[PDB]
Amino acid sequence: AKVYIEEKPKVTFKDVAGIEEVKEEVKEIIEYLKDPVKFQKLGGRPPKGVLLYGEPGVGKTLLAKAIAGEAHVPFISVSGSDFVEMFVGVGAARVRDLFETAKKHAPCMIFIDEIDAVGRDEREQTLNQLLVEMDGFDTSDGIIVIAATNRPDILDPALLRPGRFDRQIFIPKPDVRGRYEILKVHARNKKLAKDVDLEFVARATPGLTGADLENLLNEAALLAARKGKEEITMEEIEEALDRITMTISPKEKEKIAIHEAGHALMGLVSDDDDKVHKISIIPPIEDKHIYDKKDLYNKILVLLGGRAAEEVFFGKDGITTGAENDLQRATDLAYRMVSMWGMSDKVGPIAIRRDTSPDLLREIDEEVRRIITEQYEKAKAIVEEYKEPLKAVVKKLLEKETITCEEFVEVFKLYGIELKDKC
Amino acid sequence: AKVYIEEKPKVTFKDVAGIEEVKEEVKEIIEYLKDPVKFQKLGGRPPKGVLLYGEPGVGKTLLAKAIAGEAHVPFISVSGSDFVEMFVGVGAARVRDLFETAKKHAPCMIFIDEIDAVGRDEREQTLNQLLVEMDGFDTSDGIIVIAATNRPDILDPALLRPGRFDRQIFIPKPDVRGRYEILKVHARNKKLAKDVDLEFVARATPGLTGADLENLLNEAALLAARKGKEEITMEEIEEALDRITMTISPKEKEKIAIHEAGHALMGLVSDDDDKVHKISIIPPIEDKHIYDKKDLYNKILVLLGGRAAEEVFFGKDGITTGAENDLQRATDLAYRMVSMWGMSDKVGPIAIRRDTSPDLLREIDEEVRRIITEQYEKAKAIVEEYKEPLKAVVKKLLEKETITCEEFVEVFKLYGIELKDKCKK
Amino acid sequence: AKVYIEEKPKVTFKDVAGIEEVKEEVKEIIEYLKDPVKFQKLGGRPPKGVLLYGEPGVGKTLLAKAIAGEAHVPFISVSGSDFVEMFVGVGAARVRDLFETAKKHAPCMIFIDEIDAVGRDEREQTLNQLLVEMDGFDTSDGIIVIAATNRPDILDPALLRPGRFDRQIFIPKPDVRGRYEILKVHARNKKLAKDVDLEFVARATPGLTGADLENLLNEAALLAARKGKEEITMEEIEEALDRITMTISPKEKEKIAIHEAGHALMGLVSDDDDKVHKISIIPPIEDKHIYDKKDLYNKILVLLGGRAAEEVFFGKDGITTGAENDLQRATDLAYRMVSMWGMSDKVGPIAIRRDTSPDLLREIDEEVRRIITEQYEKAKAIVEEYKEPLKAVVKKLLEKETITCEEFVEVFKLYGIELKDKCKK
Amino acid sequence: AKVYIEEKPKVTFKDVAGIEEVKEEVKEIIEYLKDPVKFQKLGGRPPKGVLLYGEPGVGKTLLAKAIAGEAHVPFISVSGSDFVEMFVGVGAARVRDLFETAKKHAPCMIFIDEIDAVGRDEREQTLNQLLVEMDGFDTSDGIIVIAATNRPDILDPALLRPGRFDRQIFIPKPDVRGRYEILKVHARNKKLAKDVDLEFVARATPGLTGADLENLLNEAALLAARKGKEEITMEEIEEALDRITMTISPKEKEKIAIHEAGHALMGLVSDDDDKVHKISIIPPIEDKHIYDKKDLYNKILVLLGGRAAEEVFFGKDGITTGAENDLQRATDLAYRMVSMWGMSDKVGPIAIRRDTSPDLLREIDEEVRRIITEQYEKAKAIVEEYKEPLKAVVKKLLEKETITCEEFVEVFKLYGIELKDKC
Ligand SMILES: Nc1ncnc2c1ncn2[C@@H]1O[C@H](COP(=O)(O)OP(=O)(O)O)[C@@H](O)[C@H]1O
Ligand SMILES: Nc1ncnc2c1ncn2[C@@H]1O[C@H](COP(=O)(O)OP(=O)(O)O)[C@@H](O)[C@H]1O
Ligand SMILES: Nc1ncnc2c1ncn2[C@@H]1O[C@H](COP(=O)(O)OP(=O)(O)O)[C@@H](O)[C@H]1O
Ligand SMILES: [Zn+2]
Ligand SMILES: [Zn+2]
Ligand SMILES: [Zn+2]
Ligand SMILES: [Zn+2]
């Protein structure tokens, strides 16, 4: 209940590296905090709140410090685990004074990490106060709020409606080039040897954040100060790596890559789809859109891809618990197809209101097995057909850790195959 | 809780366009706020509350501003997300002072948008206060209240009884002629080029409101002020259209039209049914009444129409998730027919009230499938027979976006098909 | 909470018309409020409360005003939607002062409409206070209370025990002769033309109250004052009739009449039963007693009558959703017969009380279908046998809208058919 | 919250008539209130509370007035619908002052009718106070409490434990000789004609109390004062009888008698039983006792009696809804026999814990039908065998309305049949 800062940061876009795509979506806020009078006189409207969700230590705080730093504007930073009811509470009266001090020091930026504890009675009185405080203040104030979290699924859905945090940005765990740039950000301060290679350190860290990697480069100098050395060598670097041993094994990495390449392939091959994106080893579909039967079969096909890719590559005994949600998602889509949208000829256009006769349930299930197995046999076949260019995609994927959409189809072009422009 | 405005509006029936049918039902309120002493001395009774429900940004606020504006009467406005309990509360004492200030500034109009948050037990004590405040004041006060919402299904049913909001008006998302008139309202202020066409902008905006369309015409001048131009050209207009890409694709528009024309045809053809209304692409069936077996089959037939129209036009692989509620509604009607109203010869006049033997459940289901498939085969056949007049409807429907029942019937007349006078007035 | 009247009414039995049977049961209260000293010195006991339940606007308030008016005694009136808890409450202390002011102005009458909102724990504290306030005061006080409602099913069952409202009177929606007499009460004040006929207005209003009818005759003079006429003609009368369009269609009226005639026939024909009452087109089983198997079959037979009458008259496609409760009630009686009272030879004298094997459930259901279909085939056969005198009843019933049991019997006697003496007295 | 009396009654055992068996169980209280010093010096212990339960108007108040009247001791009478919470409440402080005033006016009697409303939170604070107030006071105080009710099933079970109302007495609706004596109690005050017969009035009143019969003899004099007569004749007596038209029809009376004679016969005939009592037309079995298989079959047999008697006398179409509880009770006993006590050879000594396989449920049910039908066929047969003496018992039963145990077996003796001394 006492953590918020008000500093003019020294940490800009130089201290942050690896999340270049995330950097391109925060530049419109940088141009806004620099000159809000340029945004006010024109007639535009900025986001009243920008969300920074992801795994613990992905660089949530550092991104918020870079936006205020690059724009030469103040930075405020408090925690959400601070506001806890201890003798009823004045949790709501707090929020009222945040925007009042922001208008006194306008333009400026505000930040609140782990706001999922206060925002999950008295708890809703403080939560609803923050909602009104966002809808009240306008563009003329020249201030913006950023609220981070460790879990996005446990925050209140009302803290996501327009005017009450409408922009959503995801900060992912760093890849090979993502970690190599992090290992160059912290290395500017510390003294490193001539025999040290940052590329092997970046390669041998799957399932490790930018913050958990900072713990490794700080303990390497700590072990160099304990032993007695003026240069951080490979011996103390590899020692801190054993403190960590969680992490993705190289065998698992292969399984993940093949699974991920399955989905990707499936989409870049089916009749008509809804955009293929970046393929990375670093770990519902109905919306307000209207779909036909052909569309949903392909939705199921993609969902089944990775498992089929696993089955094709490692065999029946090789399939993993990775396809857990994909299997579920696919089946559920298939039950909605049969029992809800009447897309089963055997079951007819009847719609089961989810007292249903056992025979009808049988018919529904039997048809859902028919759809799933049918599409699964179809996915397996496509992987079987494109095994060799996939093998290659997977090698590229294991080294880079993340491959965008383009190059995959180009790797397929190398194997004389034309897919479809679905990036 | 603390938003309330009492302005003499400058925005009248000139600033609102596209909802001409909605405009005809609010003119009796315009003649009432102008001279209430004419309505008092005669002996008539006005609505104590008029509902303005629809999608977010359909022009709920602007319609309420036009009624007060055209009648030259004040306009009060506040939000329903304001009155939230913060240490028990004094939310009821508020409502008491609304009608008191209204009688001091009589005649005048009152408006409250998103009243679904306050009206969804402290919450019920503020809710019940508003109910009494409506039944208390009479015609002599010369004041009316209008309460808007983003969802009509989440408001309290007591806020719909006579004397406590008895009038219901729906504001729909604008069509082609509805958006073209909206594209002429916000263009009076801004400077437009000679090469710009508002008809193509209106045609390329399916699933877009009047408020989401002003966001497009305001960003087009913003992009013209950023680049450096004195005239808003087609280049910056089409650019703001890419910022939007929750819209209906042209292929989807066809699917929607065929589905919607299915329902209409079904209804306009059914032996006996009751009323067919405006057909449009822009996206419990009993009442008190008494229906016979023949009636309910036709009710199911209509419900199945659109899907059958989809199946006939696009094929088995072409049927969409659009028929979701129709399919459900139809099945439920068929179960009520079998298990509740004893309209199944095989099942008899027995009536199931949920301990029911597995065999009987089987029999019930098997008959429900028999009725649904039977009627569905019937709908498909009706569509098949009138494919050509239906394609002609679909054509009109895609261009105008909304057609009337009379317009539908006229197209059929042209093909030499006389349909039942099931048209609403 | 704050409505309470105490006027000496001008409205007597002259202003109330159509409910003549309801008027005969309120005359003992008229003779009581006129001279209570005649009722006290003799030794008799009057009802401490008389219930006035029915549809909204059946003439609940007007009946209570006629009893006080005819007896030349004061009339107190208040609403039940007034007493709502707002900061805990002092709702019980109110009821205490009602009977105290009644003893000061003795003899007098008290009335409370919509008492179903206050009487549906603070809510129970005010409710229980009213219960004690009834048991406390006696015949010597010379006062009587009348509490009306819009729904009888939502009031507390304790407000129906002896000493706490023991008398129950139902005010029904007016019929043809009922509405014609209503049309003559509200016409004494207004000026009517020579070409106007009140009999056609009385005939073309099915499913319309005495109050919803007053809305029609008041708007007819309103349209005559708007247009500019000194006499209310047929043109403005028929115009106000289009403002109304949840009425009963003439086709529906026939279906209702036939259904209603089925139930009556079934009754007046069955071996032995428990009386047949007024048959009317104007739109939870048994007591302790002790019944035999033969009686319950006949109870089911009557329940099935109307549906059988529908099937016989309109055919299989013609059966309506009207038989919904009958069908249910009949089936439930049949399950109680089989699974509870061991009246099924196939199932034996075992008594199921819900872990029952699937086979036994099957046996139970199969027997219930056997009973229902058996009795239904029996009802259909009776309606078929008596289709002719029944068509006659239906005819009388459509014109009069309501016929007595005796009127039915009579119609049958004409076709030389003796029925059982099962009419109520 | 203001109803209790403190009178020296004038109404004794002369004003009460028909409930002579109930009169014999209240005489030990009469000898106690007369001289409690005789009961205290000897060493005996009287009941701290005596229950008076039955139908509304059976003569609950009048019995309590007769005990205080015959013993020449005061009588206190309040209602249980008086103590209702209106602004929290001082319901408990009341009970404390009842026994204090009782010790000041010792010896005396206390009475509370409809105590089921106060005794069904704050409600339990007043209820528990009455419990302690009973256990506290002893024999030396020379006072006794009597609490009546309209329903015995809705009062608290704690108001039935020893020291807290241990004595239970049932006051039944009057019979023919029961009503004839009531019609002679109220007739002492009023003037009756020479052509009037009280025996026909007593015969034509089935399902009518002593209080509901007082309403008839008071309205007969009211109709005699309205018309203008000095003597209450048969014309005004029969008129008040039409105000009543609830009542048992003569056809129903026959059905009831036959049913009741069924049970009676069954018990007076089966292998070994647990006492047959008075047979009257006026409308679980496991306890802390151990039963064998033979015993429970006979328990079921009796339970099925009346229905079998109905079936034998009126036929299959003639069976009534009267056997409702008997049928249920019998079946439940049969399920406990099969599924709980393992008394079914087909089902074995397994005990179903009331996830039970459908087949086993079938087996259980099939055996319960086997027991019920078997015993039912047995009951029907016994009625069939003793139809003629039963016919007679039923005639005797219709005229007297209540026949004790003895005479039934004597009526059977008249038809040369010997039953067993089970009275
Ligand atoms: N992507 C990154 N690039 C550079 N440094 C990083 C990155 N992510 C984390 N760090 C460093 O890790 C440390 C702690 O991480 P932090 O930003 O607080 O993580 P989070 O806010 O997600 O919990 C900081 O010193 C920060 O510089
Ligand atoms: N049966 C009737 N006969 C005559 N007038 C009637 C009748 N029923 C209703 N009205 C008239 O309708 C008006 C309002 O009806 P009201 O008595 O208040 O209905 P309710 O009390 O059932 O809600 C009154 O002016 C009353 O005279
Ligand atoms: N068994 C009876 N014998 C004589 N009089 C009776 C009998 N039962 C009731 N009464 C009379 O009926 C009247 C009211 O009955 P009451 O004793 O108050 O019934 P309860 O207490 O069961 O409600 C009294 O005047 C009483 O004398
Ligand atoms: Zn996957
Ligand atoms: Zn549809
Ligand atoms: Zn019916
Ligand atoms: Zn019995």
Side-chain angles (χ1 to χ4, degrees), chain D residues 20 38 42 58 85 118 124 139 149 162 173 176 193 197 227 230 250 259 284 288 303 324 327 336 343 351 364 384 416:
Chain D
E20 297 299 310
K38 200 191 261 79
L42 252 285
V58 288
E85 141 172 60
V118 59
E124 202 68 67
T139 182
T149 178
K173 275 209 196 197
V176 167
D197 181 61
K227 281 185 180 185
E230 286 174 289
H259 183 90
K288 301 278 197 81
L303 274 176
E324 201 187 290
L327 284 207
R336 270 145 186 276
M343 287 164 170
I364 291 158
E384 278 295 337

Side-chain angles (χ1 to χ4, degrees), chain D residues 259-260 263 326:
Chain D
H259 183 90
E260 284 303 294
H263 290 313
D326 296 329

Side-chain angles (χ1 to χ4, degrees), chain A residues 17-279:
Chain A
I19 44 120
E20 297 299 310
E21 284 272 67
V22 175
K23 282 178 190 80
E24 281 288 336
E25 279 153 78
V26 294
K27 278 161 191 179
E28 59 183 77
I29 310 158
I30 290 157
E31 282 178 67
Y32 170 69
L33 285 161
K34 264 178 184 287
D35 217 63
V37 289
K38 200 191 261 79
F39 276 64
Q40 284 148 30
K41 272 270 177 181
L42 252 285
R45 292 287 178 273
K48 286 171 171 190
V50 184
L51 182 74
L52 256 63
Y53 76 108
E55 298 274 64
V58 288
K60 295 178 263 83
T61 58
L62 200 74
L63 178 68
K65 247 162 188 167
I67 302 151
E70 275 265 292
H72 315 284
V73 118
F75 172 74
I76 296 149
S77 187
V78 58
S79 190
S81 58
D82 297 322
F83 342 93
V84 182
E85 141 172 60
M86 296 273 265
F87 185 15
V88 189
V90 277
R94 292 178 190 268
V95 192
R96 205 196 295 111
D97 219 287
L98 182 86
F99 294 84
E100 282 177 300
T101 314
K103 282 151 205 169
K104 285 185 260 175
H105 295 277
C108 58
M109 211 209 89
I110 309 151
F111 175 78
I112 322 97
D113 205 303
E114 289 183 297
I115 192 96
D116 57 81
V118 59
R120 199 78 63 94
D121 280 79
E122 213 283 287
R123 185 195 61 83
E124 202 68 67
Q125 324 292 271
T126 302
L127 201 152
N128 289 317
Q129 159 72 299
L130 182 64
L131 299 176
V132 178
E133 279 289 323
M134 294 279 168
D135 263 337
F137 95 99
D138 225 86
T139 182
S140 52
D141 303 295
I143 65 121
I144 189 154
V145 191
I146 293 169
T149 178
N150 286 329
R151 278 186 81 161
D153 57 288
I154 66 164
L155 257 160
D156 204 58
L159 289 152
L160 284 108
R161 62 214 281 181
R164 304 174 197 191
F165 274 71
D166 25 50
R167 200 176 177 94
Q168 300 92 28
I169 313 297
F170 176 69
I171 329 103
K173 275 209 196 197
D175 51 310
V176 167
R177 198 159 277 192
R179 280 180 306 254
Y180 179 74
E181 284 300 302
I182 286 165
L183 289 157
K184 278 168 100 177
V185 154
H186 309 295
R188 287 180 292 184
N189 298 265
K190 290 177 193 292
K191 302 179 277 173
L192 277 164
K194 293 270 181 185
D195 73 288
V196 301
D197 181 61
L198 296 161
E199 264 163 67
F200 191 81
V201 179
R203 273 158 70 204
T205 36
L208 278 141
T209 73
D212 289 292
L213 236 86
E214 193 208 36
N215 176 36
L216 164 93
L217 216 90
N218 258 288
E219 211 72 45
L222 250 144
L223 281 154
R226 277 192 205 110
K227 281 185 180 185
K229 280 172 194 172
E230 286 174 289
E231 281 196 308
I232 305 155
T233 53
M234 287 280 280
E235 298 104 277
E236 286 80 67
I237 278 162
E238 285 167 56
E239 262 175 72
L241 229 126
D242 290 297
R243 206 189 189 108
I244 304 156
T245 56
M246 264 34 67
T247 186
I248 315 281
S249 74
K251 178 202 115 184
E252 283 176 282
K253 209 159 119 195
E254 197 197 15
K255 297 247 202 77
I256 298 168
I258 283 150
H259 183 90
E260 284 303 294
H263 290 313
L265 173 76
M266 250 29 78
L268 283 171
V269 167
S270 27
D271 301 288
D272 269 320
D273 279 67
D274 305 338
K275 308 161 273 181
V276 183
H277 192 222
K278 288 188 184 204
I279 302 110

Side-chain angles (χ1 to χ4, degrees), chain C residues 169-327:
Chain C
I169 313 297
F170 176 69
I171 329 103
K173 274 209 196 197
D175 52 310
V176 167
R177 200 167 278 185
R179 280 180 307 253
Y180 179 73
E181 284 299 303
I182 286 166
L183 279 153
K184 278 168 99 177
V185 160
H186 307 300
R188 285 179 293 184
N189 296 264
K190 290 178 193 291
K191 300 179 278 173
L192 277 165
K194 291 270 183 177
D195 72 288
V196 301
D197 182 61
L198 297 161
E199 263 162 67
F200 191 81
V201 187
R203 273 159 70 204
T205 37
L208 278 141
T209 73
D212 288 292
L213 229 79
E214 201 194 45
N215 176 36
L216 164 93
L217 216 90
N218 258 288
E219 211 72 45
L222 250 145
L223 281 154
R226 277 192 205 111
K227 281 185 180 185
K229 280 172 194 172
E230 285 175 291
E231 281 197 308
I232 305 155
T233 53
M234 286 280 280
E235 298 104 277
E236 286 80 67
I237 278 162
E238 284 167 56
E239 262 175 71
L241 229 126
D242 290 297
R243 206 188 189 108
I244 304 156
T245 56
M246 295 73 175
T247 184
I248 314 167
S249 74
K251 177 211 268 185
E252 283 178 281
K253 209 158 120 195
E254 198 196 16
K255 296 247 203 77
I256 297 168
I258 282 151
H259 183 91
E260 284 305 295
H263 282 356
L265 172 78
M266 258 10 94
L268 285 156
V269 151
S270 66
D271 309 47
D272 172 36
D273 230 297
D274 308 315
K275 307 302 198 88
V276 188
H277 326 263
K278 289 191 175 208
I279 313 105
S280 179
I281 59 95
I282 301 101
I285 175 71
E286 231 166 64
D287 33 30
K288 293 175 163 194
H289 197 132
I290 296 306
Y291 297 83
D292 68 23
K293 201 225 227 77
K294 181 218 86 265
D295 282 324
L296 304 164
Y297 275 163
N298 291 164
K299 287 221 142 187
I300 286 173
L301 191 252
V302 166
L303 275 175
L304 292 188
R307 162 54 60 91
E310 283 172 357
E311 223 224 92
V312 161
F313 278 73
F314 309 120
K316 246 130 199 195
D317 293 347
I319 67 193
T320 63
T321 59
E324 199 186 286
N325 271 244
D326 301 343
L327 285 204

